[model samples]
Target: TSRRWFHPNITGVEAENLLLTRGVDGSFLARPSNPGDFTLSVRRNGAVTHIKIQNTGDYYDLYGGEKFATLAELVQYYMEGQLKEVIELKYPLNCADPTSERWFHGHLSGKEAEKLLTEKGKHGSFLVRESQSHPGDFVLSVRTGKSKVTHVMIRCQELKYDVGGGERFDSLTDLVEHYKKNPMVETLGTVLQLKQPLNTTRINAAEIESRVRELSKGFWEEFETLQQQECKLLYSRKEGQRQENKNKNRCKNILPFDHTRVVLHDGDPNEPVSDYINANIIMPEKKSYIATQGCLQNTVNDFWRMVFQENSRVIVMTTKEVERGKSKCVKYWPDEYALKEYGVMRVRNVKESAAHDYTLRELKLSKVGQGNTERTVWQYHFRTWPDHGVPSDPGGVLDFLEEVHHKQESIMDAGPVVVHCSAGIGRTGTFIVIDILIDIIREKGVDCDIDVPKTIQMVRSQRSGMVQTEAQYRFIYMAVQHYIETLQRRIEEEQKS
Candidate 1:
């Protein structure tokens, strides 16, 4: 008897990898770029080889390399065949039997069994047949597409290896594992699904972001102060060769340039920042806070100064710094650590929120300092909040914010914690967006590209106006998107290469 099945590969050796439609997002949804042809690269470990596909379809597009480009294609190609094989091996019937009428010719194939083509004739399309030489193996006997129903019958033995090494299970499993591990891939997948032709729920930016953060493990720290000119966010104050400073004739000695310099343009790195901005090209920022609640650093600084200088009732959490004079200078400003130190006394810790609690305490002692008095007589102490706390993974900062946000109903609960970064603005914004995007990505899912409209909307909703400049938003968005995508791509690369 014959059965109907979808084959990813139409031609010999080539899998039908092209059916993956270009998602509505502008790039193909996890489809292999080159569906028509491929080769597998294998190692000695009996590891399955991966096929590389180039040239993607139109729809959602991702800059840089993304997993779906190859993994999706591999997965799609693998499943179609596995599904057909399963159907044929499980149920074997004769076309001549009235009970076998449901079977199609396309599911059965092979020149020897081609005779079945005449018996069923055009009565139906597609067929299925168990391979005599390759037991447990089934071929597409006939189907409706470019070809007609074919002669097909089965000789039952056990076609163990006929389908051969190109089995799609490993590839499909690889992709599934990737999606399960890296939430961003799921987020990107959600984004692509939205833009693609698939059905999806409304883009719940908050819900999705919360989910991603809950799934993620990250941390953060930030600080902001009022500069003489404008409230400036000092993203990084590290020492470097100040090449640009020299070019600008400002200093041969070191100065801030690498961190502070902004290349205004479209969100795409390939395009100049100016080209995009001039034309109003909007992109999700990668670094700075795209969303924020309050000026955490400034407010804390104000509180500390007022408490110490104006003699207020508030117990201003403070710290000290030893200068070359070996004399301690009181930090009358609240840094990230200070915020946590104070927060520790205010909040209780849970297993889930445990990371945030510890991070707050650590940031207070390790990174932040405070002042109890405005004059030189301020008291100072040195204390390590917790030497052995949460392991500092790269994603630690954002992970902490996600933990904080998860407990609160609104972004306000994400408050106070939202404000403090290396430079209060960028990291602050980054943290907020991390929370917001996690919600969006978890609920709505981010595709290879980001959801600019929704992302900025949430940012503006919480901060009034945020990510300040277009460049900031794009970097922050890309960075977070990359955070998850990178993990997935690594596994995909192993499967493919």
Candidate 2:
């Protein structure tokens, strides 16, 4: 996960060419000088300097200057002004990375870009990749439809950007922004939209605070864009609007999409309303979830019916039964050691464990008069929904999510975990987005790309009005920031061990 500046076994001339051509004045590279020795190539005032790095069996030094255990430390010592000579190694030039801005994937090929874009699969999910065919140029890979991505060659002529000599822009951001408004059309009249930039969460693993501050500006502006764009999804939810199903909905306006709404199995073949539930199947790339409103007293039987039918093993509740003297949700479970029959399905709170921000209850589920063919279901009751939109900090939320995931994954072939917070779109959406992205970052490492708004957009398409307030949207970014900090800390601690 480290982007090292060290280039081994290359000639000094190559190092000079690498630094002078691609790097700024203070950019430097560390390379092997001889057997177990190294040289530092630094660009200064339009010229390159090749300085010697002496490596003894015990330590590394610059001709008897301060000794260090690693060449990285010696290089840092110079950058910090301790080994102060005319030799300046201000910025360690990364040969593979052209820019640290998340959207620019320095050397990715067209095929690799296609794989990532198609997997993300939201229309207009995009990333800027270095062009393999044309050196010193770029490729804008944007998803146009399901499993289809378009690559537009970006010509960087004389420090300006244009897609094959159409209109030139001063920066890549401007180029992308212009194209978002004015869609690029192929010769066959297919439209290529540059709507979303899939940003790389990859940064120096140890550096978290600076990245958080760096991303704070965009987070402030991005939530409003999400707020406005929830208007025009080209999908409809007809099932939830029927008269019989209307009373089952917690929030009338927010209905599950007809295509994805969870329909209960036939308890009665003649009963028309038996299949209705105000829940949607939310699949956000790496994780699967069933997002719904908290159970009401009247609909608790229906809720249990959905869980048993879907074979769901884990349930995530993100609000209290009452918050700030308002009934956020109705209690649906029995007390500890007490059994309650939710219509045909029976649920008993067998065991309960508590955490600071949440509690986990183990519920034994079975049929009303069937054999002891029972199943264990866990309901994670998160108690930290504030009086307003979001929690105080994202650290606790990340911790709580990690704990929930651990429990969910422990069971084999468990159905999609059920997630809810009252109306189920705001905090429900927030948790799912965070959970899905955390799965991405953990599996793909911090080097993987992520977009919070794009993810929320994907989730809203599955349901509706997800991650409601701008404040809730902003919390998604905070949770990711906090997660990376903890992840990096753990990684370094393991490395030290």
Q: For each of the candidates, give the backbone clash count.
A: 115, 0
Q: Candidate 2, 372: how far from true, in Å?
A: 5.0
Q: How high is the lDDT of residue 84 in model 2? A: 39
lDDT of 2: 0.74
Stretches of candidate 1 exceeding 4 Å from the true structure: 1-359, 362-397, 400-417, 421-424, 445-450, 461-465, 469-471, 483-497
Top candidate (TM-score): 2
- Candidate number of the best lDDT: 2
Encode model 2's per-residue lDDT on 328-390: one tens digit a residue: 789988998899998899998999998899888999898889887589999999997675647
Segments in model 2 whose C-alpha atoms lie over 4 Å from true places: 1-211
Q: RMSD of candidate 2 to the true fold?
A: 20.4
**What's model 1's lDDT at 109?**
40
Per-model CA lDDT versus the true structure: 0.28, 0.74
lDDT of 1 by residue, 161-222 (tens): 22232223222223222322432212223210111111111223323354345434411100
Give per-model TM-scores. 0.24, 0.61
